Write a protein that binds this ligand. Structure first.
Ligand SMILES: COC[C@@]1(C)COC[C@@H](COc2ccc(-c3cc(C(N)=O)c(=O)[nH]c3C(F)(F)F)cc2)O1
Length: 453
């Protein structure tokens, strides 16, 4: 009976985001089109994360905003066939009241982390993190292990699950660099809290490893009373190892509020029907949805649609050849998309801006991981980065595992793909892949580096 109870409590969370978005569209007097504008969804999603964040950086990152009791951003309206941008300012107390009213009195912080994860996934598909890796002394080819790297600093347990091996390594390495340059970083009251933060991140990263030797190496890193070069080296060693010996990184398909809003509006009872982020529910919901996006004059709308599709399905870090078989169209690496980002900057010219319908559908659905061996080669930059390296018996054990798994390539995991009509997953399809296609989203990447406006 517990399986249906998880579905009901997740559905209850979804339904509250839906009712909240409907009430917000209503307050703002947004049309059906404006309500389904993904830029409007972002502003409303951020408004409620900002109303509960209270400048702690738990659900959001904002530039310091003007009046602490007020929050807002850009709402876009179609006046006389043209898109206009307006800066709204809503009372944080009032936003919190609408959020709680939408969730039948409950605080529903799971609804907030759900929207925060959606933002993180959209950032993982939009902006590059290569210069950030270089600044921490890390190999920029660790770009494929950067799940949830734009998450806000105080994102708790809900953020930890979706973070990658490289994200945890980058975070822990930044602390070790501060301790190396300044011993006072591990002293006093600040040092006591940083030590507990360090031990927490170590156990979160350790939990992500799936071998005995990698977890045992994380114990050595964690027990180190004064972290220095030897801890940085082990962490980067384990990050290189995570390119072949894949870790346990939770990938959550979190949709925008302008997807949950219309489904709730049409009477879908998410609490009663149940909802699961794993499987058909997000794919089925995107088939029954209609979302729009503001687009720039030189952007391809099929490319803007792919970026949003990848963000919806938390697919930025998946093998492109796998995503192409599931979507039914060829999914291109970020360096081949002629699009620059969903969010409209304050300095952009709205007079040239147009709108387009986002293609968020998929040929097949699939589930998060007598069979036929269906292999996919490791990408060229993955093998060079993973085999870039002082000595230990756990290091030789990890090297032995990395060298024996390497010729085996990446086998597709799970029992095939499913037609959208097959809701019970009883008729799997053979997944074919054109092994000549790149396979990594970040190959030849030219996307803007992540920055807070
Ligand atoms: C480096 O990849 C490692 C391998 C080769 C290991 O074997 C598994 C294989 C790929 O498997 C899948 C990856 C992603 C999905 C999937 C699932 C959901 C979901 N709600 O459940 C979703 O929302 N979206 C997707 C999508 F494809 F779009 F990313 C299904 C299967 O990847």
């Amino acid at each position: 009976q517990n399986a249906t109870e998880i579905r009901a409590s997740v559905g209850k969370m979804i339904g509250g985001i839906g009712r909240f978005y409907i009430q917000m569209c209503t307050e703002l007097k947004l049309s059906d089109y404006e309500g389904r504008l993904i830029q409007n969804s972002l502003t409303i999603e951020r408004m409620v994360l900002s109303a509960f964040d209270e400048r702690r950086n738990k659900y959001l990152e904002e530039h310091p905003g003007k009046d602490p009791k007020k929050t807002g951003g850009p709402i876009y309206r179609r006046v006389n066939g043209k898109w206009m941008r307006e800066l709204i300012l809503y009372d944080k107390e009032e936003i919190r009241r609408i959020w709680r009213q939408a969730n039948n009195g409950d605080d529903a912080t799971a609804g907030l982390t759900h929207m925060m994860i959606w933002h993180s996934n959209l950032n993982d598909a939009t902006y590059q993190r290569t210069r950030a890796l270089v600044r921490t002394g890390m190999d920029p080819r660790m770009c494929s292990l950067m799940q949830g790297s734009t998450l806000p600093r105080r994102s708790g347990a809900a953020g930890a699950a979706v973070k990658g091996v490289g994200t945890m390594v980058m975070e822990l390495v930044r602390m070790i660099k501060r301790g190396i340059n300044d011993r006072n970083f591990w002293r006093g009251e600040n040092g006591r809290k940083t030590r507990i933060a360090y031990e927490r991140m170590c156990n979160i990263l350790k939990g992500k490893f799936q071998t005995a030797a990698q977890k045992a190496m994380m114990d050595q890193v964690r027990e180190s009373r004064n972290p220095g070069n030897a801890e940085f080296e082990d962490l980067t060693f384990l990050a290189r190892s995570a390119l072949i010996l894949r870790g346990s990184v939770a990938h959550k398909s979190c949709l925008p509020a302008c997807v949950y809003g219309p489904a709730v509006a049409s009477g879908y009872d998410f609490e009663r029907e149940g909802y699961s982020l794993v499987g058909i529910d997000p794919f089925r919901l995107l088939q029954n949805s209609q979302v729009y996006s503001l687009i720039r004059p030189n952007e391809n709308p099929a490319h803007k649609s792919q970026l949003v599709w990848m963000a919806c399905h938390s697919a930025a870090f998946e093998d492109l050849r796998v995503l192409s078989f599931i979507k039914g169209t060829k999914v291109l690496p970020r360096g081949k998309l002629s699009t620059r980002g969903v969010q409209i900057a304050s300095n952009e010219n709205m007079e040239t801006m147009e709108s387009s319908t986002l293609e968020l559908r998929s040929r097949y659905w699939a589930i998060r991981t007598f069979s036929v061996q269906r292999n996919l080669p490791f990408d060229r930059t993955t093998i060079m980065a993973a085999f870039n390296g002082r000595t230990s018996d756990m290091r030789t054990e990890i090297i032995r595992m990395m060298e024996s798994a390497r010729p085996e390539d990446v086998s597709f995991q799970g029992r095939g793909v499913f037609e959208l009509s097959d809701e019970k997953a009883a008729s799997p399809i053979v997944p074919s892949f054109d092994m000549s296609n790149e396979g990594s989203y970040f190959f030849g990447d030219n996307a803007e580096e992540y920055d807070n406006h």
